[PDB]
Design a protein around this ligand. Structure first.
Ligand SMILES: Nc1ncnc2c1ncn2[C@@H]1O[C@H](COP(=O)(O)OP(=O)(O)O)[C@@H](O)[C@H]1O
Ligand code: ALF
Ligand SMILES: [Zn+2]
Length: 673
RNA sequence: CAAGCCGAGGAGAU
RNA sequence: AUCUCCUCGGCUUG
């Protein structure tokens, strides 16, 4: 019961035979269906040729594999060919390499394939080679960039093609190369002010994919323009003239402190510059081992973060933020006990804690304007999406909807969604839970979704009525793909932000960028095949040379692997904590210090199962990892400082890998008895 | 369900 | 060439 549309056939017509190419069309245009038709045709062709038919699909997002397998690929091609879908959630009880030759239609996340290839290179596992496949398909080709996943794969493919081209003039024997297909909407641009640079970017993409063409549609183009409707653009601007009372009280506290330790901002409050100088102050103070400098800088950084959320968020949230913060601080110090600097700071806070708590309840905003727009549009509808920067923002919006009685009066449903993985002060969602909330939305049980970048790509929905960004602009690709998800016959696109910032300017950029994309695409579609080949070959060669250079510099990077040359100190107090040798490793990942001569030092805490460690000052250090019955105390380099044996250059890495010198794996024979 | 390692991209600054 | 903030994927342990 497979179906196709005219423009679909037109755009794919080259690839139906040979022509490893790309496809560029707006969202929800049957790209997936195009791919499915091509898969079926390609395999049928292989069978009629008495030749092995292997296909594979690659998606950046884990959600997307399940989506494609569920709704598009498995249904149509189930009867004809075996199909299977893989991801991180899935368990490859068989393995990858084996299923490569079992199900004959693979769908997989990228890093899986790469991992198998890399293992093959290592020889640890049988692994897999490109030859095994006959047709490699891709989605969201735009990711194919300097060190992106896809690009790693393609770099291998390109290398092999160069070898085959070398053989072409040396020896008849050659190694097969699978046909490569590409599927995207916006190949995107590398932030090029000029359109010549943009067309160069495009050509770089094509070369990274052995494109031979972009091959967009022209003839049925009108049918598509009719078929697909663009949401009406809407600018929303709100200025934070109010909020002076509360914010200014806090700003005065900040000034008090910068004077309290001679902190010259050299910039304003409510930005990143201030944060970054605060961090550089922290760096300097650790290089000094001095207090009142990194600690005060860190507290000021916390305050600036509170302010910057205030720029877009209800102040109550910032008060809760810092309330929890200093709560933990007091708990740490009491646990340690069970100086003037911290005393000044904590008291300085608590002196205004309750008063500022009272202030936080006062009204007077962008949030109000957003509520108005949402309510109005929902009444107009008689589904909704929100994008913004931070998960915390999504939660705050959900609370704002929950508490505000007007939204209840409207009856609009709403729930927040955020990305999998833990991001430090947010409860990490679950892939399963993401599916749940998504279906709740797709079942009408949720009418107003909240999401981060993850939602911007894929997440195909039949029809969404409202799309509203809230103070979120990064790059045109993000914005355009976000607009694509509107998907309703009558769609609306909104963008909210302050008028002081250049956010609106960035929006206008992305508009101009969209224009430039076509301006360049039409310049390349109408290009010489020979000149096209020359440019693409040069770009592919350049990319491969760059990768080789990067590999060589990386190889020369880590060569020291010194056993014990150092001393690890606490960073608040420059107190000795460990030595170069007393450390040991487990899982070739973690580090630990047994030899309870260390144990005489550290302190423990736990509240709410791997308990946390803290210093004799109160500095946080690490966790108590349960491994093989042992409660090994594992520490994070991110919260300590170095001193070499010689010349004492104080340094700091945040990641053990940064450090070339090596430590040994633990031998339990020591701990016996 | 918790914790940890690595890689990547983009926003901002040098 | 380099630093900070937000997102993706994979890997391990409980
Ligand atoms: N042969 C066809 N005839 C009509 N509509 C189709 C056909 N194939 C796919 N579609 C439509 O295309 C949509 C899927 O588009 P898809 O390519 O998956 O989105 P995107 O292009 O954003 O990845 C479906 O909602 C379906 O209605
Ligand atoms: F391939 Al699309 F939106 F165009 F997921
Ligand atoms: Zn300490």
């Amino acid at each position: 019961e497979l179906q196709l549309r005219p423009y679909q056939m037109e755009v794919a017509q080259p690839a139906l035979d040979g022509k490893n190419i790309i496809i560029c069309l707006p969202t929800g245009s049957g790209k997936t269906r195009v791919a499915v038709y091509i898969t079926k045709d390609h395999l049928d062709k292989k069978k009629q040729a008495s030749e092995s038919g292997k296909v594979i699909v690659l998606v950046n997002k884990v959600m997307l594999a399940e989506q494609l397998f569920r709704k598009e690929f498995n249904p149509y091609l189930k009867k004809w060919y075996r199909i299977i879908g893989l991801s991180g959630d899935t368990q490859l009880k068989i393995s990858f390499p084996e299923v490569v030759k079992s199900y004959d239609v693979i769908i997989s996340t990228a890093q899986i394939l790469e991992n198998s290839l890399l293992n093959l290179e290592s020889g640890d596992d049988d692994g897999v080679q490109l030859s095994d496949f006959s047709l490699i398909i891709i989605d969201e080709c735009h990711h194919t960039n300097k060190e992106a996943v896809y690009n790693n794969i393609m770099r291998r493919y390109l290398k092999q093609k160069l070898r085959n081209n070398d053989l072409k003039k040396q020896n008849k024997p050659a190694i097969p190369l699978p046909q490569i297909l590409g599927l995207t909407a916006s190949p995107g641009v590398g932030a090029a002010k000029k359109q010549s640079e943009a067309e160069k970017h495009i050509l770089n993409i094509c070369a990274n994919l052995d494109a031979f063409t972009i091959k967009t549609v022209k003839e049925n183009l009108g049918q598509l323009k009719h078929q697909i409707k663009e949401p009406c653009k809407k600018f929303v601007i709100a200025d934070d003239t109010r909020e002076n009372p509360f914010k200014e009280k806090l700003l005065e506290i900040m000034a008090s402190i910068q004077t309290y330790c001679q902190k010259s901002p050299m910039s304003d409050f409510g930005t990143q510059h201030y944060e970054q100088w605060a961090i550089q102050m922290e760096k300097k103070a650790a290089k000094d081992g001095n207090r009142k400098d990194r600690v005060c800088a860190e507290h000021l950084r916390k305050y600036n973060e509170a302010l910057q959320i205030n720029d877009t968020i209800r102040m109550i949230d910032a008060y809760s933020h810092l309330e929890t913060f200093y709560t933990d601080e007091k708990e740490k110090k009491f646990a340690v006990l069970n100086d003037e600097t911290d005393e000044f700071l904590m008291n300085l806070f608590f002196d205004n804690k309750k008063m500022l708590k009272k202030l936080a309840e006062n009204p007077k905003e962008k949030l109000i304007k957003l509520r108005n727009t949402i309510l109005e549009q929902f009444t107009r509808s008689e589904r909704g999406i929100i994008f913004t920067k931070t998960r915390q923002s999504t939660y705050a919006l959900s609370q704002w909807i929950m508490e505000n009685a007007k939204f209840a009066e409207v009856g609009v449903k709403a729930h927040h969604l955020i990305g999998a993985g833990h991001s430090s002060e947010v409860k990490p969602m679950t892939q399963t839970e993401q599916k749940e909330v998504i279906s709740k939305f797709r079942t009408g049980e949720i009418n107003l979704l909240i999401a981060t970048t993850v939602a911007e790509e894929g997440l195909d929905i039949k029809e969404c009525n409202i799309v509203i960004r809230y103070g979120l602009v990064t790059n045109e690709i993000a914005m355009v793909q976000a607009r694509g998800r509107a998907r309703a016959d009558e769609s609306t696109y909104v963008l909210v932000t302050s008028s002081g910032s250049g956010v609106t300017e960035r929006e206008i950029v992305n508009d101009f960028r969209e224009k430039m994309k076509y301006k360049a695409i039409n310049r390349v579609q109408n290009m010489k095949p020979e000149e096209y080949a020359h440019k693409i070959l040069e770009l592919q060669v350049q990319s491969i040379l760059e990768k080789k250079m990067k590999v060589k510099r990386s190889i020369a990077k880590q060569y020291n692997d010194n056993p014990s040359l150092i001393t690890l100190l606490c960073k608040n107090c420059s107190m000795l904590v460990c030595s170069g040798e007393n450390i040991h490793v487990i899982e070739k990942m973690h580090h630990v210090n047994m030899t309870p001569e260390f144990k005489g030092l550290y302190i423990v805490r736990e509240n709410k199962t791997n308990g946390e460690i803290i210093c004799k000052c109160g500095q946080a250090w690490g966790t108590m990892m349960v491994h093989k019955g042992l409660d090994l105390p594992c520490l994070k380099i991110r919260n300590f400082v170095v001193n070499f044996k010689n010349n004492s250059p104080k340094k700091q890495y945040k990641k053990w890998v940064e450090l070339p010198i090596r430590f040994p794996d633990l031998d339990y024979s020591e701990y016996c008895l």
